[PDB]
Amino acid sequence: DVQLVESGGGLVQPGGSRKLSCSASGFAFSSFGMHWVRQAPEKGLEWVAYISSGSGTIYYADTVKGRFTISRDDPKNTLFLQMTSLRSEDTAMYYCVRSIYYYGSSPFDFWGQGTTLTVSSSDIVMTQATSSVPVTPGESVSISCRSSKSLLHSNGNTYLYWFLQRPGQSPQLLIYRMSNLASGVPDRFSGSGSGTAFTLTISRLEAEDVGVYYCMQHLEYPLTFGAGTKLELK
Amino acid sequence: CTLSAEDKAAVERSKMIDRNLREDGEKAAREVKLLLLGAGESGKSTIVKQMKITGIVETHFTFKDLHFKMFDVGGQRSERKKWIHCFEGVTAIIFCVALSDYDLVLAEDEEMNRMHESMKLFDSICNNKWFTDTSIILFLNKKDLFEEKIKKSPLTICYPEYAGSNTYEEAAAYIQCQFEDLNKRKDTKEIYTHFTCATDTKNVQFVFDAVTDVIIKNNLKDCGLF
Amino acid sequence: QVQLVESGGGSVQSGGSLTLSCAASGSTYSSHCMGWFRQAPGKEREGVALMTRSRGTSYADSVKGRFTISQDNTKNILYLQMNSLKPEDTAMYYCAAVPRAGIEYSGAYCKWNMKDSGSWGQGTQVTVSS
Amino acid sequence: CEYTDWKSSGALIPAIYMLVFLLGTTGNGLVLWTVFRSSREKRRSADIFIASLAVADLTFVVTLPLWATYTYRDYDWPFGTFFCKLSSYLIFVNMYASVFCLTGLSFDRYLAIVRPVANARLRLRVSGAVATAVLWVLAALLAMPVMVLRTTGDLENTTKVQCYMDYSMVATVSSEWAWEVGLGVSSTTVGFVVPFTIMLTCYFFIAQTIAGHFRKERIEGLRKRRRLLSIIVVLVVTFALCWMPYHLVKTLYMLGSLLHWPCDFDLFLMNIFPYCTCISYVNSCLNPFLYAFFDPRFRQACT
Amino acid sequence: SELDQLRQEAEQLKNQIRDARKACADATLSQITNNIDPVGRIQMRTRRTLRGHLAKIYAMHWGTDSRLLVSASQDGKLIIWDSYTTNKVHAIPLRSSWVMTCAYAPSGNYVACGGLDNICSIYNLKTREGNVRVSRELAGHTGYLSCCRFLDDNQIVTSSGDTTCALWDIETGQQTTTFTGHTGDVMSLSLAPDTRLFVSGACDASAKLWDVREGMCRQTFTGHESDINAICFFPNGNAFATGSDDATCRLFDLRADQELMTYSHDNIICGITSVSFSKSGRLLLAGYDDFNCNVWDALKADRAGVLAGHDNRVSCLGVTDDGMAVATGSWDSFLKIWN
Amino acid sequence: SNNTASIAQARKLVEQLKMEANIDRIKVSKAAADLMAYCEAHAKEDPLLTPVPASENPFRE
């Protein structure tokens, strides 16, 4: 039912401007704060921009602070990302992630198909020291993510988020704030952590369980994604 | 402050909810809330139909740039005192009493006449502790049949005390006076009385005049002018 | 501020009469009442007659009942019809004008406590014979 | 024009001062106490306005016996210097507060009467206590130079000190009367000329709406129309018959300071001015009877 | 006649009930608790004040998490609050603005709402659409819906103006049981902690203990002089308390089917709109019409506290599952949290 | 008819009263003792009867 069909991108000369557009679907676009997350062709995820419900708070990343403008129009259910100055390092495939925020919310739920924008030629650190581990189906395995700054808050909720990016598929939220499994995800994924260093354990591996897993923070808005952990099938 | 990022986002959602609540309350604040009450299948359906042209029935209409909301509780059929406090802020109660009920004596079967049934219902509504400041728009619906009814039968057959002559004008005047005199709160509320019929199309105009008058008086009282 | 010049100074014997008039510019009974002050040669400046809310006939005790002051707002003049000259009356008469206090609750008084810092005239040495 | 003042200014003026103090204190105290009683019951949109008017009236009349004694002692102020400053500032603050609260209640009535749809959507803030708070703060800022400039000094060496206000602290002696005229003109303008215009235009719109709605066709309607128009015109008439004396005479004095009016007229003005102030207090003394006690709901709250 | 004979049989059975209860009564609750210590001064201070409602609050139900909380007001809006942060989570517009009952499911997935529309509406909180939508409109009651409580995510028990307390299946929208037997408008309804029995108080001055599984009324409790507007089970499902219009809230037990104590004060002459028990059942909180709530010593019948912070009648009151904070709803458009 | 409805109402009332009679009632002293035991057992876990500190309070803190 929910869809986020991205538009824009392709071959554009360095220095030009392109307006990435997201055609939202039947998920009440007016009530959702929407993000942009980029992915270089052979690299990890990096948060780009964000607009809140009603365009209240409009946060950007350091590399695109004065060059990118995120804007929304609740009519027509469309999200815009206007990129003025284009370096050759913006040749990433951008994702439009929806996020709602209340007490028992599940932020970063739907991620969107994404579009590729090809251009020719402090912030918390998540390491994810494990980048590739051999794994066989049916065996219990775990992943490790570490935070430079403790993700525990006085509200009593760690803010680590886990996404599984299947080969050729957009990231899917496995667990939001740890030990809280998302909707539509099997119970074989469990969280747990110790405020500074965190783990994600998988009880059983399947054909759809092989991919590149990412850990994200929402404590402070830079929203650093750790380098993905790849599960080599068999 | 010391709040988390998702915490500030949730509080932003709280402000958005507050703004929507305030806008919707302001929208509801300018809409006149009216209560339909009647002796039971007397004229309520006919009057709501002519004014437009299993629980509460809400009828919405606009007349001269004023939005209305009339609530009909005819089908409740339960203990009235448990839900009558809900309509405390109602601008006015539209009471529909049938003039044809004078010769009808079949109220709740027995030998009690529907005119006195409507009398005690009107007394209960007018003397309610929650309705002490809310005006009542009285409506007498059977004016097109009351003429023949009173020319074929005397008013005394329902009214043991002296009913005067048998002509339509004074009969209607006597009925109006004896439905207006149960107001123990003549100082605050006013009984707006009108003789309507099926052919009557000015019921909406009379309701507009009554509610506008109640608005002016409420504003005068709030400002201290009264 | 207010410009005011005394007129007079004629030599008159003992027991004579003369009218000392000081004409002011920008001095009204409404705003700036006027007064009369003297200078005997090598002496100290004493008051002659002062136009105040209290009394209103503030003639000096030395000159009570003999000098006559007159303030006219219409012709912005301050007559001083003295009587009976004495050799001691030889003085450089400074006509001075001070503003009037507020009406709100002060009483529209003439601030003669600020006379030194007010507006004194040039002074006219009235010559008196015997 | 060697005339000082009427003799009765030292005999009757303290008497009427004391008497109007009694009447104002009694009436304002009773209306304020009943307003405190009925604040949580009536929940009127302008209960705060009449309450602020009542407290302004209390603080207006409390220091009036000081002037009663001051005029009893001819024109000597023996209460003190800082007391002179405090009383003058309090009375000016209450002056501005009373006028501004009257026009604020007029604006509240206009917003809640002429247009109960959008004018109420702008009235939501003037109905809250924030409007009264800002009005009081603004009045205090207007009356600040009264505190700053008020002093006590003896004049004419009569050993009978008066409660005048000093000016050399900030202003030059040469342009002194010019500064005083400017201060008086600013006071008159910002305290009466604008607020009275708001009050009159608000009540004119209210009268227009009442006349448009109520008609002679109804026996009760005509009587209610006459009563409402009567109270509105009585209110505007009491304002424009209580405030013409003081401000009109003061403005006439200011004009005469630059127009050379005959000296007899000037003396007459300075002599009638205490009577003008008496009428000023009398306004505030009969204000509660014309605002709160006139309300039948307020009366039944009292009873 | 035969009707007279059956009336005589009914009178004989009523006398048998009365004398059996009299035989069971051997020592009063006050007599047995005279030796226990008093609670003292239970001074609850308002910790949170929930603002945003623009009409009279008529219902309020804590969530199982003891943090989320739904309130129903006369304007057609249900606001779900975060009591820990004074945050509004959801604001649900209502088809009918006339509601006097609202419920929060123990799972937190659904919220219930009903009133004079004669329809119980279930709203799905957790939806992929990101908004709260009406899952099912349960209809079939011929009176105003006075109460509704969730047994599970699929079963609800609702009491209405007619002398029926229907048990519904949300998925099918059908009445599994009608639960007839009352003679007045059922005004209150409290599910037992075990969640197989429940007590419904009606206008007939009687509270009847029903059975969800078998669809039957085991016990009928009398003693109240007037309408019962509030009912609440003890923390253990062996007793319940009923608030009435006679300014008295009585503690009824299920085992000995007799009133245990009456919590009344001479000064109190106003009806009791809401009744809820603190955890451990020591404190009984009753919301009154005198614009303030009273905390009662349930074991001693002592006015050990007065929560006076409302400008109108306390329409609803509830206690958290952990027993930390009580909430009060009033007609002043404010909801307050006490601790 | 209405008479048959009244007969049915009387029959159901009689049966309901009989069933209400035929249950095992207990003693009021025992019920009160059970309530007292529950109150004493769970008194410690009551934040209202026993006030909790600021750290335990999720509203005061």
Numbering used by the authors:
A (entry chain S): 1 to 121, 136 to 248
B (entry chain A): 3 to 55, 182 to 354
C (entry chain N): 1 to 130
D (entry chain R): 19 to 321
E (entry chain B): 2 to 340
F (entry chain C): 34 to 94
Sentences from the paper on this structure:
APJR has been extensively studied as a drug target for heart failure and cardiovascular diseases, with two endogenous peptide ligands: apelin and elabela (ELA)9–12. The formation of the APJR homodimer occurs through a small, hydrophobic interface at the junction of transmembrane helix III (TM3) and extracellular loop 1 (ECL1), facilitated by the “FGTFF motif” (human APJR residues 97-101).
However, upon co-expression of Gi proteins, a remarkable transition of APJR to an active state occurs, along with the significantly reduced dimeric species. In contrast, in the presence of Gi proteins, a notable shift in the antibody’s binding mode occurs, allowing for a deeper penetration into the receptor’s orthosteric binding pocket. The conformational rotation of Y105 towards TM2/3 and TM6/7 in this context might play a crucial role in triggering receptor activation. This dynamic alteration not only highlights the remarkable plasticity and adaptability of the APJR ligand binding pocket but also provides structural evidence supporting the notion that the incorporation of Gi proteins enables the ligand to bind even more profoundly within the pocket. By comparing the G proteins in JN241-9-APJR-Gi and dimAPJRAP13-Gi complexes, we observed that, in the JN241-9-APJR-Gi structure, the absence of ProtB results in a substantial relocation of the Gα and Gβγ subunits towards the region that would otherwise be occupied by ProtB in the dimAPJRAP13-Gi complex.
